[PDB]
Point group: C3
Chain length 336, copies 3
């Protein structure tokens, strides 16, 4: 009504949660607050607004994943268009639901500001990802305040997929991107020092190689990787050659910092919603899992949804897709 009476914001009520360990960074590993090494293992679900539109934003979704798919983590890809469409207040109210659901089940959330493009020039792959530096800062300001001292919310993934699309969106420049990530980290750490910022490299969060010489100059962070099957292109398709290429671009990072592969997965080239870079004959599955397990790398498969591809499920009865069936058994075995 009267703009001067608009309330100041409130923080999530931590008393509403059951006891749950905080996850933290220690050297190249995540650890829980009992000191035990921890690996994020789980899935993406679709944007909250997408799920709400078909009445699929429900605790039953989290229960299925925790109880039947072996997950300890769900990644929420918050699309800026949806953040605007629902509005911050309403969107945050739904994130609160996810927090309570995850907490009840003893699982963790990665909050992902889900854009694709080059934030320093504010140019993007598609309008669903459109944002500004101002809006991006404000999202992280609001999130960090609201979820202060909440162990369930473990990771703040600052910007899903940095890319300039062959420099059509701007001139990719590591120093500039590094500085902007450091700026976001500083805002976050000023508000909550317990959360783990997750930083991505260029080429759609595939190339971490700039961190060899110029890593982000902040402690307690982890690095993202999106090792989709068609990103590495060896002439001879075997474990050794893929492993070497992955090592060069992103895997080396796990020697020094924790790494979360926050997107990975495949569909057959003639399968549902097939597109570059997610097409594969299936051999990628065992290979990427072997690689990640060798390096202790964390992961959230894309995507546990029957509409968005590559799918893990064929329907809302959770009939597994090819990749779904594969990762389900991997996660169930890892949980044991």
């Amino acid at each position: 009504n009267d703009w001067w009476d608009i309330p100041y914001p409130s923080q999530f009520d931590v008393k509403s949660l059951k006891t749950q360990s905080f996850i933290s960074v220690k050297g190249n590993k995540f650890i829980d607050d009992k000191g035990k090494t921890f690996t994020f293992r789980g899935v993406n679900i679709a944007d909250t607004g997408k799920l709400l539109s078909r009445n699929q934003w429900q605790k039953s979704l989290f229960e299925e994943l925790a109880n039947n798919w072996g997950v300890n983590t769900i990644r929420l890809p918050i699309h800026p268009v949806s953040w605007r469409k629902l509005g911050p207040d309403v969107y945050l109210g739904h994130i609160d639901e996810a927090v309570r659901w995850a907490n009840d089940l003893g699982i963790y959330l990665i909050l992902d500001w889900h854009s694709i493009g080059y934030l320093p020039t504010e140019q993007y792959q598609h309008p669903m990802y459109d944002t500004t530096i101002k809006e991006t800062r404000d999202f992280w300001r609001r999130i960090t305040f609201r979820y202060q001292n909440v162990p369930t919310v473990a990771v703040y993934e600052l910007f899903n997929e940095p890319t300039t699309m062959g420099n059509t969106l701007g001139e990719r420049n590591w120093a500039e991107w590094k500085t902007l990530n450091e700026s976001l980290i500083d805002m976050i750490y000023a508000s909550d020092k317990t959360v783990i910022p997750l930083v991505a490299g260029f080429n759609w969060a595939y190339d971490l190689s700039p961190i060899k010489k110029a890593p982000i100059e902040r402690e307690g962070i982890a690095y993202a990787a999106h090792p989709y099957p068609q990103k590495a292109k060896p002439e001879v398709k075997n474990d050794k050659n893929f492993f070497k290429l992955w090592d060069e671009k992103w895997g080396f990072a796990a020697d020094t910092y924790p790494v979360i592969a926050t997107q990975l997965g495949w569909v057959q080239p003639d399968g549902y919603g097939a597109h570059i870079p997610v097409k594969d004959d299936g051999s990628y599955g065992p290979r990427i899992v072997k690689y990640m397990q060798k390096k202790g790398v964390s992961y959230t498969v894309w995507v546990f949804d029957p509409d968005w591809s590559p799918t893990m499920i064929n329907d809302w009865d959770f009939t597994p897709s090819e990749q779904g069936a594969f990762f389900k058994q991997v996660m169930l075995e890892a949980k044991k």
Copy 2:
């Protein structure tokens, strides 16, 4: 209708005003155009839009202040949300009213772009204060053009209360803020060299100390200070200790440049709309007045409104509040 026919803007008609002295900066003082030392002494009123909503935007308001409260100055806190809500054209049309009313009564206006936060990152304490560098420049561009050669409009207070809220809004950086103020000053001086820009420091316009080594590198400006009672926190509460702390952070500035305390005031801790940093037992009143009178510091008390706190009045019949009664007698005595 057709965007190509939208008129270019017009300037305030100076022929509509009665003769009134221009106020200017000379060394550490303000002077009128007869050469006599001048002190701004007055009050804030509420945002124009707030007053309009209850039909309280009236000349009778200015008349009460000039005739009965001893003021020579009114500060208008133009909130960006209200600037947008009324629209520039309509808001400026109401500022024109204030100009004619003030001019008729021989009093002056401070125009305050009333935001709280960190403009370089475009992050703010509350959405009522939300703005951008672009909108802020445009506000000053429009204001400076419209009120060219108008003596009644004396001071352009560029940004009410700079703060990063413990670096949650961004990393406070004096060089960056100094440069941005210099940029705004350059736009203003390109359009009207007679106006006085008023520059604020960090910690909600409390800390001017960076100007000891790095003052804004422009002539004819003054500095703002917001010495609310709870800003200085001496262990022993007496004149000497408060004076020393005020000296350290803002009072020293008055030795070299003119200073306007554009917000100050108090309410009892159990009084109406009490909040940090405006709570005091009342002893602050005599103390801040003694301090300002000693240093020749100008001031506008916050706020001459019965709804917005700390109030100077309890109702629209102008029943004085505690601080209202106090400052009313101070201003009346100073006017004599």
Copy 3:
């Protein structure tokens, strides 16, 4: 409907066009792809949205110009307010029409992002020109993608008229403007290397003199000039004195780079829609044409419209205005 289903954009179908030479830059000249020196000679028409509003956006308009006025070029001044009003999708669909019409007639288009002001501070002469760096980049991103490999679209005129209006809009700074143009060029060249970027100087695209020491550091570009009659102000009004002043500020550029005078023209001081800087007794016409022909300078007269001034026509039956009659004969003679 559902934002995740919003289509990715498509490119203009080059198979829809008849064969037409590409125009390119070679040293200080334009050449066609047969190697012959080429001069752009033509007119501006009004903004597409302006023409649509009165049902004047028609192929008949292009046919009149190509068949009866001797043009080989039409400049389209795309106003940001109109880009927003129609929306990118609809505006681009109308530009597609112009492409097909021009191509059919064997003539070329200059696409002009038609703003006036200082892009680095995002401050402008009038709201019809209002834009941001983000919107400007996005316009060029969309344009370059859509018209890839289209010979008909020859020139991308990045920003119509740079000016700070006496530094009221910001502090003019060549290094800053040069860098921003280079940034836009890099985005464009990443998407289509065949197009010709057209760069403007300060003082409403009049002053190219900064390029003597600090030219844009990219190949294949041309420079704009807007030599309106009142821009040069010799005390003695003859060819020699105007030529010298034009030489100093913009004409020298044609010695080293190709130049397009993308706005020029006049109306009598007591004529229709007369204003600075377009007022002249008519002697300017022969003088500017003589000057341009001497230097091999390309041009598009402002403006072939009966409402927008200075006009080339008095009505939609194409009754020529004074300047219209003059330039019509110049262009017809040049075409022969």
